[PDB]
Amino acid sequence: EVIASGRLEKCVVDGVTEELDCQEKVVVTLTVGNGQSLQTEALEFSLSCLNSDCPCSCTCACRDLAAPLRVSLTKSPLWASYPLQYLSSFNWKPLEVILRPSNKVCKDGDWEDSPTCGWFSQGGVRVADSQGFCCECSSSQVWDDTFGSSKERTRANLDCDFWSDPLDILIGRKPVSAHCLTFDPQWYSGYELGAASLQFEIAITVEVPTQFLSPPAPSTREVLHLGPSVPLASSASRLLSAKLLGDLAMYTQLPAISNQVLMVPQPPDALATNRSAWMLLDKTMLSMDGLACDKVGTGFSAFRYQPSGCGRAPQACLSGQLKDLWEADLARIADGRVPLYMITRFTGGSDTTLQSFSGGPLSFALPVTSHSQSLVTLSVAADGVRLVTNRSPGKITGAAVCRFAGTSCGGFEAVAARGYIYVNITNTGRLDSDYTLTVSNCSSNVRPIEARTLAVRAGSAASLDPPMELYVEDQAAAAARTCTVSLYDSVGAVTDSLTLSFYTNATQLHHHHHH
Amino acid sequence: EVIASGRLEKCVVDGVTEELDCQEKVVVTLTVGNGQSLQTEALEFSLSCLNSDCPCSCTCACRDLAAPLRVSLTKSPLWASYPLQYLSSFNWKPLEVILRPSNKVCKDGDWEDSPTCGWFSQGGVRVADSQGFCCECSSSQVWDDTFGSSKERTRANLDCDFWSDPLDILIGRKPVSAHCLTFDPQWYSGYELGAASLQFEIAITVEVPTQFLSPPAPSTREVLHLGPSVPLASSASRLLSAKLLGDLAMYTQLPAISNQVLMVPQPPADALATNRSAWMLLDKTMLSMDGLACDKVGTGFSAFRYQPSGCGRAPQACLSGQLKDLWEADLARIADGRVPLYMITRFTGGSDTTLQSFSGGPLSFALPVTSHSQSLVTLSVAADGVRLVTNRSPGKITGAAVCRFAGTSCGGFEAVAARGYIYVNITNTGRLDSDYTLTVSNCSSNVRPIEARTLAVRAGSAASLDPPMELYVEDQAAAAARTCTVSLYDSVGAVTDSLTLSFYTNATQLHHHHHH
Amino acid sequence: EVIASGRLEKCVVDGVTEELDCQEKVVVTLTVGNGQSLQTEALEFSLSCLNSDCPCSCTCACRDLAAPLRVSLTKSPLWASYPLQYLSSFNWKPLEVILRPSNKVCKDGDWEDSPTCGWFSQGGVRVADSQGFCCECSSSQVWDDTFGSSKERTRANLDCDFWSDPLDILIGRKPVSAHCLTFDPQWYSGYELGAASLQFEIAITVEVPTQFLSPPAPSTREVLHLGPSVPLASSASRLLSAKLLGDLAMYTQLPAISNQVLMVPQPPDALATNRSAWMLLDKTMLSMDGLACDKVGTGFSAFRYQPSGCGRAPQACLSGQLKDLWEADLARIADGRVPLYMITRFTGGSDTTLQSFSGGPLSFALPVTSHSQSLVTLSVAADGVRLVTNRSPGKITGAAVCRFAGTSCGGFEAVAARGYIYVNITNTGRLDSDYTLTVSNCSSNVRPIEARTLAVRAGSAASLDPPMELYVEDQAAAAARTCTVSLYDSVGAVTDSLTLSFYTNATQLHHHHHH
Ligand SMILES: *[C@@H]1O[C@H](CO)[C@@H](O[C@@H]2O[C@H](CO)[C@@H](O[C@@H]3O[C@H](CO[C@H]4O[C@H](CO)[C@@H](O)[C@H](O)[C@@H]4O)[C@@H](O)[C@H](O)[C@@H]3O)[C@H](O)[C@H]2NC(C)=O)[C@H](O)[C@H]1NC(C)=O
Ligand SMILES: *[C@@H]1O[C@H](CO)[C@@H](O[C@@H]2O[C@H](CO)[C@@H](O[C@@H]3O[C@H](CO[C@H]4O[C@H](CO)[C@@H](O)[C@H](O)[C@@H]4O)[C@@H](O)[C@H](O)[C@@H]3O)[C@H](O)[C@H]2NC(C)=O)[C@H](O)[C@H]1NC(C)=O
Ligand SMILES: *[C@@H]1O[C@H](CO)[C@@H](O[C@@H]2O[C@H](CO)[C@@H](O[C@@H]3O[C@H](CO)[C@@H](O)[C@H](O)[C@@H]3O)[C@H](O)[C@H]2NC(C)=O)[C@H](O)[C@H]1NC(C)=O
Ligand SMILES: *[C@@H]1O[C@H](CO)[C@@H](O)[C@H](O)[C@H]1NC(C)=O
Ligand SMILES: *[C@@H]1O[C@H](CO)[C@@H](O)[C@H](O)[C@H]1NC(C)=O
Ligand SMILES: *[C@@H]1O[C@H](CO)[C@@H](O)[C@H](O)[C@H]1NC(C)=O
Ligand SMILES: *[C@@H]1O[C@H](CO)[C@@H](O)[C@H](O)[C@H]1NC(C)=O
Ligand SMILES: *[C@@H]1O[C@H](CO)[C@@H](O)[C@H](O)[C@H]1NC(C)=O
Ligand SMILES: *[C@@H]1O[C@H](CO)[C@@H](O)[C@H](O)[C@H]1NC(C)=O
Ligand SMILES: *[C@@H]1O[C@H](CO)[C@@H](O)[C@H](O)[C@H]1NC(C)=O
Ligand SMILES: *[C@@H]1O[C@H](CO)[C@@H](O)[C@H](O)[C@H]1NC(C)=O
Ligand SMILES: *[C@@H]1O[C@H](CO)[C@@H](O)[C@H](O)[C@H]1NC(C)=O
C-alpha cells in the first residue's frame, strides 16, 4: 500500500567542506506486509537521461534517453525470537525407590557413614539429605494389624501383624522401610526466555534498464536488504536510497512468555526431532532451590522432610514433574483441549510450523500472524512514479473448524477449548496476486478474528498456517454457529465468500459430593 | 490529522487477461484517534462529471457537471479484550468444622470404613484425605491442665483438666477433636486470560451528491466499516477504496494481565451488583492448582490434613488467603484510599459501569484503552481535488479534582501506597461538534507525567473523562498543595481554557516489629 | 526522515459563528529518531511577504519580501518509566539466634507469659509465633551419644552424652535449645511496578528571519515542546502548528517487569547512592503473608512450625533472603554471568546509566535502546519546503565484546552468559551529523542485533551506552566468531566498517553422582 508520494529537494551539506548540494528526488513511502512474500506490486520511476540525472548524444561513454525503473518489495516470514539464558537442569521424572531390608535395619542418619539408601555426591562432597528417610511401624499399627486390620496407611504397605513375622517382632525388630530418591536417566535443560524481538528481512528488487503491452528490454536486477539489524541500504551507483522506519502496532499482541522457562531435552517408536519434545513452563511449576514438593526440580531436602511422610502414599511429593506435565497435556489433546506446557500450544497442533525457523539449535521463536505493516521510504533520483499491481481472482477451496492438532473437526468445547480455522484458497489468475482473508458477521457471542493476508503464486493453492484461533464468549452448546469467510483480491474486491458453520459443545466443571 | 495527500497513477494488471489499466486517483492518508467518536472533520473531493470520471449533455442516462464528495471518519470506543480458557473451579471460602464427639472416639484412618468426618466423593470413588484429621490431648497437656494451666495451644481449645472429666480420663478416654474441611456453597470458575487483542470499528461515512455558506443539495449517505477483522472496504460503485493499515504504538502500554486467572462467580443453576462487579483477577502465586499447598486459593484435602503440627495450630489454619479473604482484604484497601489488588476494578479506577459498555459475550473480559492509539487509514478516490473541513468549537474546563479510588474522598491521596484519579469536566461552548485535547503539564516536582486524552464533545454538551486519569507521585513526603496545569485544546491546537489543579499527598506508611 | 510533504487546503469552521475560513498550507510529515539529540537536519520553508501570508511597500507597520523559515527537531533521551505501588517491608537477612539456657529450661508456649525467646509486638499486641520453638534431645539420641556417637543431627549441635553432664541428666533435665528469629537492622521497602510508559520530549526549534553559501541574517529562535503529555503545540503568532501522532512499534520489546516487586533500602567502604542497592524480584521469591519458608519475607509462623525443625540444620527455612539473593548475584558477576535480581541486569553493568533519569527519588525507568520513531506533522503557512541535512564522515574508533560489568573482555559464556558490544565512533567532519550503527553478516548461530543511531557533535567521539547485548544460539565453544560492524552516515552511506571477532566458552551444567 502506497502511503505518500511526491517530490522533495534534499540538500546535503558535506561535513568536511561545509558545502551545499541539492537534488529533487521522488520520495515514496509504502508499507510491506507480513504475509507479502511475492512480487505482486511494482513501482515504476520514469527515468530521463538513462545510464550516467539531456544526454551528450553519440569510446563515447554517454547516456541514453528514456526507460522505466522498476522496483518491487517483498518481506521474509515474520518471527518473534526470544533469547535464552540457561538456569539449571531438571529431571524428567524423579522416582522413589522403596527398600524393605532383609535384616530389618534402617539408617538415615545425618552423619551416618553408610546409610541404607546411600549418599549422592556433587564431586567429592556428598549431597545433603540424599540418604532418604526410614519408616518404622508404630506400636499403634502393630496393635491393630495383629488383632483386626489397621486403618492407618503405611508408605510401604507394611504388614505389622505379629503373626506375619513373630520370631522378630518379639525381639523388638519391627518391619522397617527405606525410601530413597532416584533420578530418571533423561534430563532436561531449562533456559529462561527473554524479550521478544521481531526478526525479518525486506528484499527490495531494483532493475534498471538499458492497450496492455509493457515489454521488458534488457534489465539488470539488483536486490537490497532491509531489516531491524540493517534498517537502510542504497542501490548500485546512487539512484535509490531506502530506509526502514519501523512497523505499526500489532492488533493482537504476542503471548506473554517472557518470564517462563524453556525445557529442552538434555542429549546423552522414536521421539520426534527438534522442538517437538520441548516445554515452556511458568515459574510457579518449578522449585529452583529444590526445597518445595510436587514441583519441577524437587530436591532431596523436600523429599526427606515432607511432613508425615511415612504416613503418606508412595511417590508423594514427587508429582508435577516434567513427565507428569507432559502426560497431562497429551490427555488434554485427546479431549479436544489445548496443551498448557508444550510449546505447540501456540502453533495450534503441528510442530512443522516451528522448524521453518532459521535460528540456531538453541533458539525459540513463534510465527507472527498479526498484522505488522513495516513502513519503508524510497527516494529515487528520477521524477515520475507509477504503481503497477497485479489483480488475480481467487476462490475459497475449503474452510472448516478443527480442534487442537486436528483430532476432530466440526467444532470444539465452548470455553475450555478453542477451534482452529483451516482455510484453503486457490489463485485462479495467471499472475501472482496478494489476497486478504477475513472472518466477519459472525453469530452472537463469537470472538472477533483479525484478518490474514496470503501471497499466492499463479495457479497455485495456499492455506492458512498457522490457522486462525476461534473462541466463543459463552458457555452454552450450539449446534450451528455461523461466520462469514471472505476472500479479497488486491485493491479490496471480494472474489469469493462462504459461510462457515460449526458447533460448540458445552463446558464441563469439577464437583465434590459431600457426606 | 491528515498526513499525506496527492495524486498517484495506480495501474492494475487483470490476472486473467494479463491486461493493463491505469487511473490517476487522489491518495489521502490520515489518522483516526481513539476518542474520536463524532464527525468533526470532513474530506471534500472535487467531483467533475458527476453520476457515471466530460458529460454527454442531455432515457438519456447521462452525467452532470460538478459537486463535492464529502467523507468523514469516526472510531468506536477502543477495548482490549482477552480470550478466556477455563482451568478449574474454586470455593469462595473453605471452612473447617471442629467436632468434639460425645463418645470421645475419633477415626481418621486412610482405609477407615466410616470416619468421624466422612468421605467426599468425585462420583463413585471417594476423594483421598477428605476425612480430615483427629487431635488427642497429649499426656504433657493433661499434666499441665490438671495442676496448673497448660500453655500449649490446642486447635479445639480442649480442656484436659482431669477434674473437668475424671470418670473418662481415668479409663484412658482423653478428650479428642475432629477437624473436617467443608466448602462454601458459593463456587467460582477460573479462566486463564490470553493475549490482548485491540478491538474497534472505524465508520467511514461517504455521501455523493447528484463567506461561509456551503449548502448541501441532495446527498446519499453510505457507511463503510473498517477494523482489525476487516481492514479494508470499497464504496458503492467504485469511487472510494479504503484500507486500514494499523495503529501507532501506545505510549503507556496495557496492563500485563495475560497470565492471570479470572475468577467468575459460578451461578447456582441487600443484593450483589450484576455482571463483573464480583469478578476477580489473580496472579498464579495466589493459587494451588493441585491443591497441595496451604493458604492458597484452591487448597485441597491433602494440604489441610497433613499440615505440620496441625493439632498445635489455631483453628482455620491453612485456610487463609481464600477468595473470600482476598475480597474482604481489597474492600479494606478501598476504605483506606488505596487501590484493590485482586478485584478487576483496579484498572477501571472505581466504577464497574465502565466495564459494562463492552459488547462481548457473557464470558468475556476487556479493558477500555485510554492511551493514544492512532490508526492510519489510506483513502484513494477517483476524483482529483481534495480539501479538509474541520470544525473548531471553543471549550471550557467546567471542573477538575483529584479523588481516591472509587471516590471515597477527594482532594488528594496517599503518596506511594495509593494513587489519585483526575476527573475533568469540559463543556462544548460552540454550536458545532468539535474535537478536544486534554493535557496535564507543568506539574510540581516529583510528579509522574500523564499522557493526554482526547474528547469528542457534541455541541452545547458537557463531557467528562471516563475512566479518569491516574496520578502518581515519585516521592514519599507529604505535601499540602502539589500543583499541575490542566489545559484544554480545541481542534488545530489552540488553548481555549486552562486552570491549575492543586492536590495534597499524605505521607506513606510502613510496617514495624518491636522486639523483646 | 521526511515521509510526506505537499500542499493542503485546511478549512476551519468557527463553531461560534458557523463560519468558513480556508488556507493552503504545506503539510510535512517526518519522523524523529530515538538517538536523535542534535540538530542534524533542518526544514526550510520559503516565506513570501515576511513579518505579518504582496507587501504594502514603505510608523508604516508593513511587511518585507522574502526569507527562509528554518525548522529543526530533536528528541530527548527515551525512558520507560514504571509507576510504583508500595506493598510491604522486607528484612535484609532474618537471623536465627540459638540459645542454650543455663538452667536447662525452655518454654515456647502459645499462652506462655514469658518464653525463653520473648514476644515481638506490632504495637501493644504481641505477634503470634514470635517466641520461636524449643528443642530437646530425644531418648534415642541420649542413648546413642552416651555409648557410641549419635548419627542424628541436632539443630544446636547438642551433646547428649550422659558423661558430658551426668548430674543433671540423671534428674531428668536433658539438654535443651531455644531457637528465636531476629531481624537484621537493614530493612527494605517493596514497591510493585506498574505498566511501562514511554517518556520523552521533542524540541521543535523554529527561527523566523526579518555554490555553498547560505548566510543567516537576524533570526529569532523559538522552541516548541511536544511529547506524550502534550502531543501538540503552535508557534508564536500562527505560522507553524505541530502535532505528535505517536511512535512506531519497537522491534525488540521491553523487558516484562510489570508484575515484579522493586526492593529499595529503607533509610534510617560505603554503598553507592540511589539505585545501586536496588533489586527487582519475581513474586515467586516472596512470601506476602510470611507463611512460606526460604522466601523473602518469611514470617514467624513459617519458622516456628517448620516440619522436623529441630532435626534440621541451623538457619534452615531462612535461605533465599534479600542478602542471599544479593550475594548470589555478585557471584554470577564474578563468573561472567548476568545478575537475576539486581536492577543492573538491564543496564548491562554500570549504574551510572540509570542516574541520568529525571524522575523523583522513588521512581524506576530503563533507557530504551530499540528504535522508536515518532511521527510529527508540520503545517506551515508558507508554500515551498526544503530539507537541509548535514553529512559528516565517521570512523569506528574501537569495538570489543565484554562480559557483564566488564569483568573481562574478548568473549562470554555461550548460553549461561551474554556479551556486551562497546563501540567507539568519532565524528571526523566539521558538522553535527547523525549516524547508524549496525551489526550484520555474522557467523552461524549468532543472534541478530537491532541497529542503533548516534548523534555525534563535530570533532567529538561517541560510544554506545548502554552497549548492545550479544547472544549465541548454540552451546558449542568457538575460538573466533565473527560479525561485521558498519557505520553509516546520514542518507545511508558507509563511512567505516570493521569485523568484530570474539570467542564463546562452552556452557556448564549440574550433575549428581549416584551411589
Ligand atoms: C485443504 O487442502 C489440503 C490439501 O492441500 C487438505 O489436506 C488433505 O486432507 C485429506 C483429508 O481431509 C487427506 O486425505 C486423507 O489421506 C489419508 C492417507 O493419506 C495420508 O496418510 C497419512 C495419515 O495416515 C498422512 O501422514 C499422509 O501425509 C497422507 O496425507 C487417507 O487415509 C484419508 O482417508 C484421507 O483420504 C489428504 O491427504 C490431505 N492432503 C494433504 C496434501 O495433506 C485439507 O483437508 C483441506 N482442508 C479443507 C478445509 O478443505
Ligand atoms: C572506548 O573509549 C573509551 C574512552 O572514551 C575507552 O575507555 C578507556 O579504557 C582504558 C582501558 O582500556 C582506560 O585506561 C585505563 O586507565 C587505568 C587508570 O585510569 C582509570 O583508573 C580507574 C580504574 O582503576 C578508573 O576508575 C578511572 O576512571 C580511570 O579511567 C589504568 O590503570 C589502565 O591500565 C588503563 O590504562 C581509560 O581510562 C578509559 N577511558 C575513559 C575515558 O574511561 C574504551 O576502552 C574504548 N573502547 C574500545 C572498545 O575502544
Ligand atoms: C463533573 O460533573 C458531574 C455531573 O455531570 C458532577 O457529578 C455530580 O456530583 C455532585 C456532587 O459533587 C452530585 O450531587 C450530589 O448528589 C447526591 C445524590 O446522588 C447527593 O446526596 C449530594 O448531596 C449531592 O447533591 C451530582 O449528583 C453529580 N451529578 C451527576 C450527574 O452524577 C461532578 O461532581 C463534576 N466534577 C467536577 C470535578 O466538576
Ligand atoms: C532441527 O533440525 C535441523 C534440520 O531440520 C537441524 O539442523 C537442527 O540441528 C535440529 N535441531 C535440533 C535441536 O534438533
Ligand atoms: C450478517 O448476518 C446476519 C445474520 O446473523 C444477516 O441478517 C445480515 O444480513 C448479514 N449482513 C451482512 C452484511 O452480511
Ligand atoms: C459434541 O462432541 C461429540 C463428540 O465428542 C459430537 O458427537 C457432538 O455432535 C458434539 N455436540 C454437538 C452439539 O454437535
Ligand atoms: C451483563 O448485563 C447484560 C445487560 O446489561 C446482560 O445481557 C449480560 O447477560 C450480563 N452478563 C453477566 C455475566 O451477568
Ligand atoms: C510552570 O509553572 C511554574 C510554577 O511552578 C512557573 O514558574 C513556570 O513559569 C511555568 N512554566 C510554564 C511554561 O508555564
Ligand atoms: C491526610 O489524610 C487525612 C485523612 O486521612 C486528612 O484529614 C488530611 O487533610 C490529609 N493530609 C493533608 C495534608 O491534607
Ligand atoms: C539520586 O541522586 C540524585 C542526584 O544525583 C538525588 O537528587 C536523588 O535524591 C537521589 N535519589 C536517591 C533515592 O538516592
Ligand atoms: C560476509 O563475510 C564473509 C566473510 O566470512 C564474506 O565472504 C562475505 O562476502 C560477506 N558478505 C557481505 C554481504 O558482506
Ligand atoms: C574461556 O574462559 C577462560 C577463562 O575463564 C579463558 O582463559 C579462555 O580463553 C576462554 N576460552 C577461549 C576459547 O578463549
Side-chain angles (χ1 to χ4, degrees), chain A residues 8-12 21-25 27 377 379, chain C residues 1-2 41 386-389 491:
Chain A
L8 178 65
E9 180 164 323
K10 294 179 179 292
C11 299
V12 169
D21 182 78
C22 300
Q23 287 180 296
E24 188 184 81
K25 296 170 178 291
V27 180
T377 300
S379 297
Chain C
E1 184 71 19
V2 179
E41 305 191 77
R386 190 173 76 162
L387 179 64
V388 190
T389 303
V491 200

Side-chain angles (χ1 to χ4, degrees), chain C residues 16-38:
Chain C
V16 184
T17 50
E18 216 161 340
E19 189 171 89
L20 184 71
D21 182 78
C22 301
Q23 287 181 20
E24 189 184 81
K25 296 170 178 291
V26 167
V27 180
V28 178
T29 311
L30 75 172
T31 67
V32 193
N34 168 32
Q36 179 196 330
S37 62
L38 293 181

Side-chain angles (χ1 to χ4, degrees), chain A residues 441-443 482 484:
Chain A
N441 198 20
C442 281
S443 63
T482 63
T484 304

Side-chain angles (χ1 to χ4, degrees), chain A residues 399-403 408-412 419-422 470 500-503:
Chain A
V401 175
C402 302
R403 305 192 302 179
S408 75
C409 297
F412 59 96
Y420 293 91
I421 309 179
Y422 296 85
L470 173 59
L500 178 52
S501 44
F502 67 99
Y503 68 84

Side-chain angles (χ1 to χ4, degrees), chain C residues 51-346:
Chain C
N51 296 28
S52 304
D53 295 332
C54 198
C56 72
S57 75
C58 189
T59 59
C60 273
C62 203
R63 319 185 187 107
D64 307 356
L65 169 60
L69 172 65
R70 217 170 192 272
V71 177
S72 182
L73 298 85
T74 60
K75 187 172 172 181
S76 66
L78 186 57
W79 294 88
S81 174
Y82 296 82
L84 273 59
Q85 181 183 24
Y86 176 78
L87 293 186
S88 178
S89 295
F90 305 96
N91 194 255
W92 175 244
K93 183 55 171 174
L95 183 66
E96 170 193 10
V97 170
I98 300 183
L99 300 179
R100 294 168 188 81
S102 48
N103 49 13
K104 310 180 76 67
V105 75
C106 200
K107 318 168 181 179
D108 59 69
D110 299 288
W111 340 100
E112 186 62 89
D113 205 68
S114 61
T116 52
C117 278
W119 289 80
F120 278 79
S121 60
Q122 284 222 339
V125 58
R126 55 195 217 277
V127 184
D129 306 334
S130 60
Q131 68 278 352
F133 63 98
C134 290
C135 298
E136 185 180 331
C137 202
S138 78
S139 49
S140 180
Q141 297 165 336
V142 183
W143 207 300
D144 300 326
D145 271 328
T146 300
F147 297 150
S149 191
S150 185
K151 308 306 188 62
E152 305 170 23
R153 182 221 314 266
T154 56
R155 197 159 189 166
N157 198 267
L158 288 185
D159 185 7
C160 314
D161 186 4
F162 179 82
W163 307 121
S164 55
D165 188 12
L167 290 81
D168 269 358
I169 300 177
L170 177 63
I171 57 182
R173 309 176 76 94
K174 294 182 176 181
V176 297
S177 309
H179 301 258
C180 326
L181 184 57
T182 55
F183 294 134
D184 188 292
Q186 175 59 52
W187 284 89
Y188 271 65
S189 298
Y191 311 90
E192 180 190 50
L193 296 196
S197 302
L198 297 173
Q199 299 187 349
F200 60 97
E201 169 157 285
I202 295 175
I204 298 180
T205 309
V206 183
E207 46 189 301
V208 59
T210 182
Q211 191 78 342
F212 70 98
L213 281 180
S214 51
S219 69
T220 52
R221 307 177 190 183
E222 181 184 1
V223 182
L224 296 184
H225 296 290
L226 265 64
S229 40
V230 187
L232 61 87
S234 283
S235 70
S237 72
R238 292 149 196 85
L239 263 179
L240 173 59
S241 184
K243 173 173 181 57
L244 179 64
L245 314 165
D247 288 46
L248 296 176
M250 290 167 49
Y251 280 138
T252 66
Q253 290 184 349
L254 290 178
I257 67 179
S258 187
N259 292 331
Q260 301 196 355
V261 184
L262 183 72
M263 300 297 172
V264 181
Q266 186 167 333
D269 309 357
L271 57 83
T273 53
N274 258 251
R275 318 152 203 269
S276 171
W278 292 16
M279 305 179 68
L280 187 64
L281 276 55
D282 188 301
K283 287 185 181 177
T284 57
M285 314 291 294
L286 319 180
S287 190
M288 300 309 297
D289 47 8
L291 312 176
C293 273
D294 299 306
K295 299 292 184 179
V296 172
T298 291
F300 291 134
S301 298
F303 170 77
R304 175 173 165 94
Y305 295 84
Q306 44 183 142
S308 307
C310 291
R312 296 190 54 84
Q315 295 296 106
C317 177
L318 295 190
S319 72
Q321 305 305 293
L322 298 175
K323 182 171 172 292
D324 300 325
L325 309 178
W326 182 268
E327 293 177 351
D329 265 357
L330 300 185
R332 293 184 65 92
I333 297 179
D335 203 0
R337 300 187 179 180
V338 182
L340 301 155
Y341 311 107
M342 322 200 317
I343 65 175
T344 61
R345 67 180 186 275
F346 315 106

Side-chain angles (χ1 to χ4, degrees), chain A residues 481-506:
Chain A
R481 268 161 182 167
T482 63
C483 288
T484 304
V485 185
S486 302
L487 188 45
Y488 289 93
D489 57 18
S490 183
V491 201
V494 189
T495 51
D496 198 4
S497 70
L498 49 75
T499 56
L500 178 52
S501 44
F502 67 99
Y503 68 84
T504 68
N505 254 307

Side-chain angles (χ1 to χ4, degrees), chain B residues 321-352:
Chain B
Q322 305 305 293
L323 298 176
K324 182 171 172 292
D325 300 325
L326 309 178
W327 181 268
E328 293 177 351
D330 265 357
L331 300 185
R333 293 184 65 92
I334 297 179
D336 203 0
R338 301 187 179 180
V339 182
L341 301 155
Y342 310 107
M343 322 199 316
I344 64 175
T345 61
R346 67 180 186 275
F347 315 104
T348 84
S351 69
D352 180 71

